[PDB]
Amino acid sequence: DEEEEAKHVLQKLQGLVDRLYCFRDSYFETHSVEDAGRKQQDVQEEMEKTLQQMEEVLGSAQVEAQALMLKGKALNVTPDYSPEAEVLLSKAVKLEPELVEAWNQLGEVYWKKGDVTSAHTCFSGALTHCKNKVSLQNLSMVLRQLQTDSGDEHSRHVMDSVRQAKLAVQMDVLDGRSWYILGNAYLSLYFNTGQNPKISQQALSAYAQAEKVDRKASSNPDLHLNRATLHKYEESYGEALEGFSQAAALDPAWPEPQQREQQLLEFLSRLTSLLESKGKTKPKKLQSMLGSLRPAHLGPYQSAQKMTLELKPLSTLQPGVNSGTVVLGKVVFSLTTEEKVPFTFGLVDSDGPCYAVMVYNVVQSWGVLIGDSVAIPEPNLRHHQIRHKGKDYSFSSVRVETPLLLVVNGKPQNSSSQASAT
């Protein structure tokens, strides 16, 4: 009778915790996004109600490993680090070292505590007992975030993050959390290895696959934010702004997406003002600057093969890469960004409108000054027309993938100006 009783007690405990996690995981299936502000408090109070029921189920009965685990899991339902969960789960894994779910929960608890190393030990440890989706997901997450004094180590961890996320996805391709995690792994890979647009496409495609297979992924504020950060870097500015805004709506107490949205709007306002005013430069000063241009400022060209480029006005450029062409103008202003990339400046090569130039893959100290001549080979031109929350931003830009493509005052740029190795 004691055995059946203990099993019945465990099943009741399991149910309580499963329902608590479904309450949280499904919150936006049963609540509107207008109620997003209430989610954390509702989840906190469900947890407390759940722990109370668990305690009534247990009474003074002996607490076996699975019961310790289930209570710690319940305590770990919120974003907050729980010292009680840590104690309970640390005991569970001593009483049952093969209990994978206790190791995964204990790793998540360590992660919330800010102890990434211990988290990683837990997820790795779990995988020495059984291959399982949650350990692979968590391991992917922790790997892209391990701190290391070595750049090569970090690149290996980023690559490993993708590997583990792919293993997680393959165990269950209908799990939207796995796709989201893979998205994040690709996102880090993209930024670690010189921004190969194929890899950003793989990130975007993973996030889209998350939302496709699992409605819950559309309510993941981190998915919206992370995708928006990618859109921002690739200059899909409207989509970035919508992404930050959607992430903010899904978690109104979370500052980051609101701060990101504010910063990008501030960047776009400053940029368009400075373009329209040509850096607040009077016609006299512009004519002076434009007259200081010469033949030698064309400088260098090789396409990594020898090429002679035709000097053409910015106004004559087509959208996309303009093959066979070079532009040469004067810098009328510059604009920096919290993240230090891209370096942005305004360029004029006539009485016509000023164009923005965004230079990616640049070191912090790199730049061009007001009055510099700049030549850009085969400029990649884009026209921007952004409409967000009743405000419009329109302007045209040249996206320069690396400062090593630029000629400043007739001089090519040294290899040290580029952030990733060449």
Swiss-Prot record:
Keyword terms of this UniProt record: Cytoplasm, Cytoplasmic vesicle, DNA damage, DNA repair, Mitochondrion, Nucleus, Phosphoprotein, Repeat, TPR repeat
Q: How is it modified after translation?
A: Phosphorylation by ATM kinase induces nuclear accumulation while interfering with nuclear export, and phosphorylation by CHEK2 kinase enhances nuclear stability.
Q: Where is this region: Mediates interaction with 28S rRNA of ribosome-coding tubulin?
A: 282-284
Give one Pfam hit by family name: TTC5_OB
Site Mediates interaction with N-terminal MREI motif of beta-tubulin nascent chain: give positions.
144, 222, 256
In the record for this protein, the TPR repeats are positioned at: 4-58, 65-95, 100-127, 133-171, 176-213, 221-250
GO-annotated biological processes: cellular response to starvation; DNA damage response; DNA repair; positive regulation of mRNA catabolic process; positive regulation of transcription by RNA polymerase II
Q: One GO CC annotation, please?
A: nucleoplasm
Q: What is the effect of changing residue 200 to A?
A: Loss of phosphorylation at S-200; decreased nuclear localization in non-stress conditions; loss of nuclear accumulation and stability in response to DNA damage. No change in subcellular localization in non-stress conditions
Q: Which InterPro entries match?
A: TPR-like_helical_dom_sf (IPR011990), TPR_rpt (IPR019734), TTC5_OB (IPR032076), TTC5_OB_sf (IPR038645), Ycf3/AcsC/BcsC/TPR_MFPF (IPR051685)
Its induction note reads:
Stress-responsive protein. Induced upon UV or ionizing irradiation (at protein level). Induced upon heat-shock stress (at protein level).
Motif Nuclear export signal is found at 10-21
The membrane spanning regions, by residue number, are none
- Organs and tissues of expression: Expressed in heart, brain, spleen, lung, liver, skeletal muscle, kidney and testis.
GO MF, one annotated term = ribosome binding
User: Phosphoserine modification sites?
Assistant: 200, 218
- What is said about its interaction partners and assembly? Interacts with JMY and p300/EP300; the interaction occurs in the nucleus and augments the association between JMY and p300/EP300 in response to DNA damage. Interacts with PRMT5; the interaction is DNA damage-dependent and promotes PRMT5 interaction with p53/TP53 and subsequent methylation. Forms a complex with HSF1 and p300/EP300; these interactions augment chromatin-bound HSF1 and p300/EP300 histone acetyltransferase activity, resulting in enhanced heat-shock-responsive transcription.
Describe its function.
Cofactor involved in the regulation of various cellular mechanisms such as actin regulation, autophagy, chromatin regulation and DNA repair. In physiological conditions, interacts with cofactor JMY in the cytoplasm which prevents JMY's actin nucleation activity and ability to activate the Arp2/3 complex. Acts as a negative regulator of nutrient stress-induced autophagy by inhibiting JMY's interaction with MAP1LC3B, thereby preventing autophagosome formation. Involves in tubulin autoregulation by promoting its degradation in response to excess soluble tubulin.
Copy the domain comment: The tetratricopep-repeat (TPR) motifs may function as protein interaction domains.
- Protein name stated in the entry: Tetratricopeptide repeat protein 5
Q: Which organism is it from?
A: Mus musculus
